[PDB]
Amino acid sequence: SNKKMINGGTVNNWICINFSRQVQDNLARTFCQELAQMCYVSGMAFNPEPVLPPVSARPEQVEKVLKTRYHDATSKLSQGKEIDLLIVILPDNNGSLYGDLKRICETELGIVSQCCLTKHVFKMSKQYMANVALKINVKVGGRNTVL
C-alpha cells in the first residue's frame, strides 16, 4: 500500500508565487490547478481557484513580494478569513531562497507554505502531485496513513 489521506484538511484560500525565470504565468497556473485537483480527489477540501493569480518575482525581492502578496490577498478575503496555503515555485538550485522563504512564512507571516522545484513543474507527474498533496495535507492539519 502507498500512503493515503485519513483525514483531509481544508484549503479554501491559497496563492502562488513563482521565483523561476523558466516558468511563465500560465505554467504556474496549470501546475497549481493540477495540484489543487490532486489534493481534492485525495480527500481534501481544496478551492480550485487562488485568491489572486500567480505572480513572478526575483529571489532578491523575496521579502517584499511575500509581504505584499500576503497583504493584497488577505485584504481580498471576507473579514476574518485567512490564507491557508502559499505554493512557491523555486529554481532547482536556489541558494538562500528556500531558507529565507521559510523564515518569513514561519515567523513573520505565519502562513503554511509548500515549495515545488521547477523540474517537477515541467514534468507534473501524478506520483509527484500525490506526494505533494500528502505533504500539504499534514501542514494544514489533516492526517495521513503510515506504512
Ligand X SMILES: Nc1ncnc2c1ncn2[C@@H]1O[C@H](COP(=O)(O)O)[C@@H](O)[C@H]1O
Binding site for ligand X (CB under 6 A): 90, 94, 98, 113-115, 117, 135
Q: In the bound complex, what is the minimum distance in angstroms from residue 90's beta carbon to ligand X?
A: 5
Q: In the bound complex, what is the minimum distance in angstroms from residue 79's beta carbon to ligand X?
A: 29
In degrees rounded to 5, what are phi and psi of residue 120? -80, -25
* 16: β partners: 87
Q: Which is nearer to ligand X, 76 or 125 (CB)?
A: 125
Rg (CA), the chain: 15
Q: In the bound complex, what is the minimum distance in angstroms from residue 114's beta carbon to ligand X?
A: 5
Q: In the bound complex, what is the minimum distance in angstroms from residue 124's beta carbon to ligand X?
A: 14
Q: Quick count: other Cβ atoms within 10 Å of Cβ 12? A: 14
Q: Which is nearer to ligand X, 109 or 115 (CB)?
A: 115
Label the pairing between strands 5-7 and 143-144.
Answer: antiparallel
In whole angstroms, give the CA distance from residue 26 to residue 65.
19
Residue 96 DSSP label: T
* C-alpha distance from residue 13 to each of 5, 38, 51, 101, 138 (Å): 20, 16, 6, 19, 17
Q: Which is nearer to ligand X, 76 or 110 (CB)?
A: 110
Q: Which is nearer to ligand X, 48 or 99 (CB)?
A: 99
